[PDB]
DNA sequence: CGCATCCGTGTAAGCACAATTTAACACTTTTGTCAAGC
DNA sequence: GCTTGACAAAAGTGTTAAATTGTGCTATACTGGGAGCCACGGATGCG
């Protein structure tokens, strides 16, 4: 649960990086959102990891 | 990216949504870039044309 | 069953009535917080460290600046240029160039 | 001694001052060495 | 090796060899007589679990008489 | 966005919460409340505590 | 729903997926913004100046060439998809692999050549597959193995499965030593490497309540018979036999450094004071044969295991 | 203003090249050792 | 009791080869997942 949250947070720093279309950064944002979400309370929104 | 602590999303009830005055399933949609939201209008430039 | 910590546990009686000297080596990082190493007699002080913030900081006393020599990373015009060479692409910006004229 | 227990909210700063350096790599151990990786996991 | 070991090997005629000591021994509370024992070893083509070079069973009898605590019925 | 841009400032995802945080403030929804509470003589003085 | 994979896939399709005649036009203006970057910076380097037109000309491409590109980007998008979908079940999220397929089109999209007249659709799918197996290898393991290894333990699997496959029954470390050209060591190190580790977490006992972890001996822990001998010692051994001899172990503390814990050796003890090498090399052997002695010799017997 | 019903919730790389780390070899300095004598 | 000098073995410096690890490239066309074998309390519209 916690590399979960590292891998995302490091590929959003590169998508940030190399300026891509809102449409991959929104994407990722709302995976960093989700895997946060997994890390403290897995299964209270959506389905568990 | 910051991100929401999701015991004060979804608390039963929201405590956030009650903090910001905004109701279920639409503090949701925001969190989870389902639809925008305006942070601020500047009434003053309105006023000047 | 039984396993190990990939480690190894000891029982040498701890003292601090006699301890090497210290001399604390204070690092300044770019957001303007400084952080405090205390580092040994031996000296050979590292010019810049990594900080408890996550980001390395330079030493504070001002002396072993680095020469930036490091090779420069890769570029979408590096690719570019590789495919193409400089005239075909001034034919194409004098193209372009013409028809927002017309 | 112990008196009272306080359960306040954490911010920022109390995480980043509680912290003693930040986590930058997924790694956990060396798959040869099995030593922890640096600036990742179980970083010495 | 502590320095404090290192002088007592140097008082007696000892060396630290490099093996533990991981012998089998008889659990606290079991004893009797030895009546049997198998072995089975990777060098004579047994069927051995993957990493075991050999495996030693030892079967131990003992005879138990009626005393204070026993159940009967 | 494109035709009144500078009219208003909008945003998504946990950053337009943030924002909203940061430009809010506590004691006017607490009068408000307060207000409702000693005047709500519908469905709105429960909402209001 | 909350599923995050329906909103993703519901949302490419605000794009229609572009042609051949449709697709050209896009690289062209990006390499003519690229190249108009190019121009403005050789002449803010150079000193130069451009007619205002020129200058509004030049900016307003740039920005195409960048529109151009976020186009192109969004309506490849669902190429990314279409091919991330097969590596599903590898032990990685779906959308991290969508992700990483996007970072191999962006790369695809900055390599792409127009001039060889090929289609577009034929050249990122090798950068997206590129990107997804650089991101399979580099993080779907909890302990990391480097690339060249992963692509061992890979071509190791198949060439299992494939002799499998082959004879029906499963094969020998012979056998793979004899197919792969490596020593059946070599192949037990490899499966060794390949081995993935369980979780605590696991629940044990045959009933719900207990966990794995419950039952791991702590050997590391420090026990006390031990722990408390091992002081005694330093009352023992570290302190009476020194007082009954003087500097014959005064000097015994140096060598093995009881006081500052530092061994020494004999010219650093020596080098200090009025005594040479060789006359320490002799009081130590002289110490030897003393604590030798029965008397002094029986008392420590049972501190040696 | 109370009740019926709706909702939230606890099946598919491999190659090439560059860069870093680790070992093997060679020589040199240092350490411990021995005899003998001052 | 202590010192001098030759000698053998162990511990450093440095060069080199090798193993080990990281990054980039492959152009028919291929473009929107697939899994899947409940009861209780709090709230809102209706009468």
Same mark, same amino acid.
């Given at each position: 649960?916690?590399?979960?949250?590292?891998?995302?947070?490091?590929?959003?720093?590169?998508?940030?990086?190399?300026?891509?279309?809102?449409?991959?950064?929104?994407?990722?944002?709302?995976?960093?959102?989700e895997?946060?979400?997994a890390?403290?309370?897995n299964g209270?929104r959506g389905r568990p990891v | 990216?910051?991100?929401?602590?999701?015991?004060?999303?979804?608390?039963?009830?929201?405590?956030?949504?009650?903090?910001?005055?905004?109701?279920?399933?639409?503090?949701?949609?925001?969190?989870?870039?389902?639809?925008?939201?305006?942070?601020?209008?500047?009434?003053?430039?309105?006023?000047?044309? | 069953?039984?396993?190990?910590?990939?480690?190894?546990?000891?029982?040498?009686?701890?003292?601090?009535?006699?301890?090497?000297?210290?001399?604390?080596?204070?690092?300044?990082?770019?957001?303007?917080?400084?952080?405090?190493?205390?580092?040994?007699?031996?000296?050979?002080?590292?010019?810049?460290?990594?900080?408890?913030?996550?980001?390395?900081?330079?030493?504070?006393?001002?002396?072993?600046?680095?020469?930036?020599?490091?090779?420069?990373?890769?570029?979408?015009?590096?690719?570019?240029?590789?495919?193409?060479?400089?005239?075909?692409?001034?034919?194409?910006?004098?193209?372009?160039?013409?028809?927002?004229?017309? | 001694?112990?008196?009272?227990?306080?359960?306040?909210?954490?911010?920022?700063?109390?995480?980043?001052?509680?912290?003693?350096?930040?986590?930058?790599?997924?790694?956990?151990?060396?798959?040869?060495?099995?030593?922890?990786?640096?600036?990742?996991?179980?970083?010495? | 090796?502590?320095?404090?070991?290192?002088?007592?090997?140097?008082?007696?005629?000892?060396?630290?060899?490099?093996?533990?000591?991981?012998?089998?021994?008889?659990?606290?509370?079991?004893?009797?007589?030895?009546?049997?024992?198998?072995?089975?070893?990777?060098?004579?083509?047994?069927?051995?679990?993957?990493?075991?070079?050999?495996?030693?069973?030892?079967?131990?009898?003992?005879?138990?008489?009626?005393?204070?605590?026993?159940?009967?019925? | 966005?494109?035709?009144?841009?500078?009219?208003?400032?909008?945003?998504?995802?946990?950053?337009?919460?943030?924002?909203?945080?940061?430009?809010?403030?506590?004691?006017?929804?607490?009068?408000?409340?307060?207000?409702?509470?000693?005047?709500?003589?519908?469905?709105?003085?429960?909402?209001?505590? | 729903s909350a599923d995050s994979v329906?909103?993703?896939?519901?949302?490419?399709?605000?794009? @229609?997926?572009?042609?051949?005649?449709?697709?050209?036009?896009?690289?062209?203006?990006?390499?003519?913004?690229?190249? @108009?970057?190019?121009?403005?910076?050789?002449?803010?380097?150079?000193?130069?100046?451009?007619?205002?037109?020129?200058?509004?000309?030049?900016?307003?491409?740039?920005?195409?060439?960048?529109?151009?590109?976020?186009?192109?980007?969004?309506?490849?998008?669902?190429?990314?998809?279409?091919?991330?979908?097969?590596?599903?079940?590898?032990?990685?999220?779906?959308?991290?692999?969508?992700?990483?397929?996007?970072?191999?089109?962006?790369?695809?999209?900055?390599?792409?050549?127009?001039?060889?007249?090929?289609?577009?659709?034929?050249?990122?799918?090798?950068?997206?597959?590129?990107?997804?197996?650089?991101?399979?290898?580099?993080?779907?393991?909890?302990?990391?193995?480097?690339?060249?290894?992963?692509?061992?333990?890979?071509?190791?699997?198949?060439?299992?499965?494939?002799?499998?496959?082959?004879?029906?029954?499963?094969?020998?470390?012979?056998?793979?030593?004899?197919?792969?050209?490596?020593?059946?060591?070599?192949?037990?190190?490899?499966?060794?490497? @390949?081995?993935?580790?369980?979780?605590?977490?696991?629940?044990?006992?045959?009933?719900?309540?207990?966990?794995?972890?419950?039952?791991?001996?702590?050997?590391?822990?420090?026990?006390?018979?031990?722990?408390?001998?091992?002081?005694?010692?330093?009352?023992?051994?570290?302190?009476?036999?020194?007082?009954?001899?003087?500097?014959?172990?005064?000097?015994?503390?140096?060598?093995?450094?009881?006081?500052?814990?530092?061994?020494?050796?004999?010219?650093?003890?020596?080098?200090?004071?009025?005594?040479?090498?060789?006359?320490?090399?002799?009081?130590?052997?002289?110490?030897?044969?003393?604590?030798?002695?029965?008397?002094?010799?029986?008392?420590?017997?049972?501190?040696?295991?």
């Amino acid at each position: 649960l916690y590399r979960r949250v590292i891998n995302r947070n490091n590929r959003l720093k590169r998508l940030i990086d190399l300026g891509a279309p809102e449409i991959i950064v929104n994407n990722e944002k709302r995976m960093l959102q989700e895997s946060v979400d997994a890390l403290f309370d897995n299964g209270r929104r959506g389905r568990p990891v | 990216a910051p991100v929401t602590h999701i015991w004060y999303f979804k608390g039963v009830p929201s405590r956030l949504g009650y903090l910001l005055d905004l109701a279920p399933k639409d503090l949701e949609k925001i969190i989870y870039f389902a639809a925008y939201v305006i942070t601020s209008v500047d009434d003053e430039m309105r006023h000047n044309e | 069953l039984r396993g190990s910590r990939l480690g190894a546990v000891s029982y040498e009686t701890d003292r601090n009535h006699d301890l090497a000297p210290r001399q604390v080596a204070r690092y300044r990082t770019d957001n303007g917080e400084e952080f405090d190493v205390p580092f040994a007699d031996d000296a050979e002080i590292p010019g810049t460290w990594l900080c408890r913030n996550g980001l390395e900081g330079t030493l504070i006393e001002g002396d072993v600046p680095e020469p930036k020599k490091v090779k420069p990373p890769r570029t979408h015009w590096d690719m570019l240029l590789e495919r193409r060479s400089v005239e075909e692409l001034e034919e194409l910006l004098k193209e372009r160039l013409d028809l927002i004229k017309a | 001694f112990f008196d009272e227990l306080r359960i306040g909210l954490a911010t920022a700063d109390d995480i980043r001052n509680w912290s003693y350096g930040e986590v930058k790599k997924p790694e956990t151990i060396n798959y040869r060495t099995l030593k922890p990786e640096k600036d990742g996991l179980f970083c010495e | 090796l502590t320095p404090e070991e290192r002088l007592l090997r140097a008082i007696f005629g000892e060396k630290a060899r490099e093996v533990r000591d991981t012998s089998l021994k008889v659990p606290h509370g079991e004893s009797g007589k030895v009546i049997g024992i198998r072995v089975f070893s990777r060098e004579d083509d047994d069927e051995l679990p993957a990493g075991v070079n050999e495996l030693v069973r030892v079967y131990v009898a003992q005879k138990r008489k009626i005393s204070d605590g026993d159940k009967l019925a | 966005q494109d035709r009144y841009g500078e009219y208003f400032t909008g945003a998504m995802g946990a950053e337009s919460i943030k924002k909203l945080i940061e430009n809010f403030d506590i004691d006017a929804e607490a009068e408000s409340l307060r207000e409702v509470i000693r005047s709500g003589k519908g469905q709105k003085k429960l909402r209001a505590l | 729903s909350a599923d995050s994979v329906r909103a993703y896939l519901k949302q490419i399709g605000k794009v @229609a997926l572009l042609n051949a005649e449709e697709e050209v036009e896009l690289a062209k203006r990006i390499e003519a913004g690229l190249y @108009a970057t190019q121009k403005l910076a050789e002449l803010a380097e150079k000193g130069e100046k451009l007619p205002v037109q020129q200058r509004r000309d030049m900016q307003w491409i740039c920005r195409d060439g960048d529109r151009a590109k976020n186009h192109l980007l969004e309506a490849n998008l669902r190429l990314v998809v279409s091919l991330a979908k097969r590596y599903t079940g590898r032990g990685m999220a779906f959308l991290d692999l969508i992700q990483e397929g996007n970072l191999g089109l962006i790369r695809a999209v900055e390599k792409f050549d127009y001039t060889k007249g090929y289609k577009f659709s034929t050249y990122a799918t090798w950068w997206i597959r590129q990107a997804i197996t650089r991101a399979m290898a580099d993080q779907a393991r909890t302990i990391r193995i480097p690339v060249h290894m992963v692509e061992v333990i890979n071509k190791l699997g198949r060439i299992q499965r494939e002799l499998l496959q082959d004879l029906g029954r499963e094969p020998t470390p012979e056998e793979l030593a004899k197919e792969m050209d490596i020593t059946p060591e070599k192949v037990l190190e490899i499966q060794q490497y @390949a081995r993935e580790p369980i979780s605590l977490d696991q629940t044990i006992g045959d009933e719900g309540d207990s966990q794995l972890g419950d039952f791991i001996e702590d050997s590391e822990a420090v026990v006390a018979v031990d722990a408390v001998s091992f002081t005694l010692l330093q009352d023992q051994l570290q302190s009476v036999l020194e007082t009954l001899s003087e500097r014959e172990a005064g000097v015994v503390r140096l060598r093995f450094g009881l006081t500052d814990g530092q061994p020494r050796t004999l010219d650093e003890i020596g080098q200090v004071y009025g005594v040479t090498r060789e006359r320490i090399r002799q009081i130590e052997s002289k110490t030897m044969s003393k604590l030798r002695h029965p008397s002094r010799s029986q008392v420590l017997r049972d501190y040696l295991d």
